[PDB]
Amino acid sequence: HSSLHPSIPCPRGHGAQKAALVLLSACLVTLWGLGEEHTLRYLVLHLASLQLGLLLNGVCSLAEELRHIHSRYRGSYWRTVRACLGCPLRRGALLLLSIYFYYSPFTWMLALLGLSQALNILLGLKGLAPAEISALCEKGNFNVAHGLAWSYYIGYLRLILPELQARIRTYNQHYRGAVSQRLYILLPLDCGVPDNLSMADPNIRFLDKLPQDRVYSNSIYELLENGQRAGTCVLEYATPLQTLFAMSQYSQAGFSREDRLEQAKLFCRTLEDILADAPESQNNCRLIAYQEPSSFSLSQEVLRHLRQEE
Amino acid sequence: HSSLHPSIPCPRGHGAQKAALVLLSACLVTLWGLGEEHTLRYLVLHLASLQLGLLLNGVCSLAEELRHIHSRYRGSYWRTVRACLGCPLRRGALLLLSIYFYYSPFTWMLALLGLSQALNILLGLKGLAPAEISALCEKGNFNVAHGLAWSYYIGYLRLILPELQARIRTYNQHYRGAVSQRLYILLPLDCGVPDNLSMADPNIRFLDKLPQDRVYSNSIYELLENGQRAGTCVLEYATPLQTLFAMSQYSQAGFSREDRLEQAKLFCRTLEDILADAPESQNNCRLIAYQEPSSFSLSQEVLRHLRQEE
Numbered sequence: 001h002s003s004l005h006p007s008i009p010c011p012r013g014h015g016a017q018k019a020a021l022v023l024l025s026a027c028l029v030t031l032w033g034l035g036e037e038h039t040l041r042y043l044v045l046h047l048a049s050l051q052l053g054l055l056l057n058g059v060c061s062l063a064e065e066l067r068h069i070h071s072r073y074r075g076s077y078w079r080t081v082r083a084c085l086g087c088p089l090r091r092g093a094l095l096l097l098s099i100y101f102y103y104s105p106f107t108w109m110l111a112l113l114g115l116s117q118a119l120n121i122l123l124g125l126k127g128l129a130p131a132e133i134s135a136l137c138e139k140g141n142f143n144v145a146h147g148l149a150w151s152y153y154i155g156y157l158r159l160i161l162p163e164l165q166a167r168i169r170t171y172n173q174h175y176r177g178a179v180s181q182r183l184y185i186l187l188p189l190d191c192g193v194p195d196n197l198s199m200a201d202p203n204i205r206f207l208d209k210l211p212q213d214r215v216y217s218n219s220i221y222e223l224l225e226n227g228q229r230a231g232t233c234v235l236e237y238a239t240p241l242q243t244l245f246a247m248s249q250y251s252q253a254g255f256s257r258e259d260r261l262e263q264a265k266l267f268c269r270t271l272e273d274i275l276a277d278a279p280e281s282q283n284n285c286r287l288i289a290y291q292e293p294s295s296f297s298l299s300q301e302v303l304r305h306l307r308q309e310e
Numbered sequence: 311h312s313s314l315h316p317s318i319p320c321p322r323g324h325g326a327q328k329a330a331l332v333l334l335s336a337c338l339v340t341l342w343g344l345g346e347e348h349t350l351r352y353l354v355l356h357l358a359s360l361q362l363g364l365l366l367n368g369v370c371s372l373a374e375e376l377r378h379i380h381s382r383y384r385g386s387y388w389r390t391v392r393a394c395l396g397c398p399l400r401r402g403a404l405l406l407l408s409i410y411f412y413y414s415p416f417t418w419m420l421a422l423l424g425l426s427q428a429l430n431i432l433l434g435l436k437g438l439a440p441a442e443i444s445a446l447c448e449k450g451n452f453n454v455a456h457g458l459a460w461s462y463y464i465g466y467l468r469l470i471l472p473e474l475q476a477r478i479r480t481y482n483q484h485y486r487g488a489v490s491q492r493l494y495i496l497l498p499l500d501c502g503v504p505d506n507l508s509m510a511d512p513n514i515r516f517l518d519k520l521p522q523d524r525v526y527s528n529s530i531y532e533l534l535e536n537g538q539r540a541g542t543c544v545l546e547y548a549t550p551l552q553t554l555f556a557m558s559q560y561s562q563a564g565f566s567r568e569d570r571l572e573q574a575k576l577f578c579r580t581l582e583d584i585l586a587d588a589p590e591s592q593n594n595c596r597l598i599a600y601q602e603p604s605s606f607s608l609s610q611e612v613l614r615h616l617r618q619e620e
Contacts, residue, residue, distance in 0.1 A: 008379035008579050012374055017432060019373035024428035027421045034421060046426055059476040064419035065441050071319035086439045103441060111337045111344060116356055118334035122327060127369060129396045131375050137447060141580065147457015154556045189317060209361050224459055246464045250543060252587050270451065289315040295506050
């Protein structure tokens with residue numbers, strides 16, 4: 001229990017599976033009504049016919065995973081097969097057990113299963129309950145990309161992006177000076193965010209403040225390509241990406257450097273979708289989702305996005 | 311597509327179900343090998359035997375949902391049955407269609423299904439693929455309770471809670487004055503957060519600052535019970551709860567006042583679990599998860615938690 005308020009739900013315990021012992025016993029107190037007996041033969045010759053269906057679902061869902069294998073699975077085939085089917089060790093042990101039992105019209109008996117499992121997912125019947133949907137979604141304690149993208153747009157973006165173009169031209173009309181039309185939001189996929197950008201590259205080393213209630217001290221950085229001013233624009237890291245970084249450095253929380261490469265591949269995607277919904281903000285700021293491999297320099301890919309403005 | 315970087319995965323399209331048309335056609339180009347024919351009879355007399363299993367799973371999972379019906383479903387029985395089974399209109403239409411077809415050993419034929427669906431969830435075979443687990447979890451754009459609880463503990467709690475007891479005794483040794491041992495974090499379940507607490511109740515009306523790099527201007531409030539100082543403690547609202555409030559006032563985002571009563575019933579739970587993991591913080595701050603119904607006064611339930619300290 002330990003609930004601080006009666007409205008707040010306790011986490012879901014094992015009350016679901018302990019009712020299955022009752023359901024298992026209820027069909028097994030029928031045993032004398034069953035015994036007078038090849039009922040163990042028809043159990044595994046039925047549980048094969050479910051386990052082909054989950055196998056045929058993993059085959060059919062593998063066409064979707066194949067499109068995103070490189071982005072999601074770094075170009076590896078074996079991670080895609082593991083993601084498509086799951087843990088087949090508990091399943092395949094029931095496969096090879098069922099081979100012996102029907103050994104003790106099979107070409108038709110596969111033709112019914114592939115026909116059934118096609119219609120079972122084409123008419124949308126492969127769909128859980130809203131309890132089971134909210135069971136596993138409450139199970140993962142780190143589902144932390146939507147809560148960080150939306151806290152960044154509500155918290156920091158929508159409070160600074162309408163008033164940004166005012167401070168751009170004011171710093172431009174004070175200067176002489178050249179200022180980029182929109183703010184640049186860097187998105188390091190490795191989540192390594194330094195507090196200063198002057199050590200991220202020697203090219204970026206610069207600082208300036210801007211005039212404007214809510215004190216937001218944005219910083220303009222100069223991109224010094226081969227010792228020459230190739231572009232003066234405002235750049236700022238993603239503040240939720242330090243949150244994903246500091247969660248991996250919270251070793252009590254089971255947050256790896258691989259979960260940190262999933263949410264930072266998702267928060268960088270959902271933030272584009274949030275900025276695509278707001279009309280003015282999509283033309284107000286540009287996201288740079290740079291990832292450190294090989295060697296590179298991030299001052300080029302800023303200037304990839306900066307030169308294409310004009 | 312529209313991907314800003316090749317590592318970032320595009321959202322999952324309909325490539326999964328369009329491969330099922332191939333699987334449906336592959337078992338249906340076997341038709342002359344099937345036709346020479348009651349194969350439509352054995353399709354629905356098989357798809358009943360899957361649809362009893364999903365029905366028997368919803369019956370068995372209903373024992374778990376019943377424990378949390380009041381907290382999750384406000385004490386309503388019909389919302390619990392809808393959450394346990396889902397949308398039975400696409401399923402029950404295949405139920406009553408299958409009644410006519412076997413009409414055109416049933417007591418045993420139910421005894422095998424309840425035996426099978428018990429073992430199918432007791433040996434953990436009711437378990438999806440990590441693609442399908444990450445399919446629906448990417449589908450809900452508002453999974454925003456873990457991303458707000460963890461951004462509050464990493465961002466604001468762990469930066470102010472170690473240095474809190476220093477500022478409590480310093481404001482106490484400057485005074486005369488009585489200060490509570492730990493900071494109080496209010497959690498309004500209706501997400502209605504005013505910028506001042508003096509209008510939340512007339513009892514709370516007070517303000518003070520505290521001495522201390524990171525400027526965090528906490529505010530101490532006096533609880534004036536019947537015009538008398540019943541307790542002087544520091545109280546502050548949940549800043550992620552204004553985020554859940556402002557998302558509902560973003561009408562382009564499909565965020566209702568019912569989703570806002572799920573994440574604010576979850577962020578208030580996960581924040582307790584995060585503070586339970588950190589050893590010093592659990593004895594450093596106390597969460598008050600008050601919910602406005604009926605009439606009430608929140609200055610009492612602060613003093614419920616304040617008087618029990620000593």
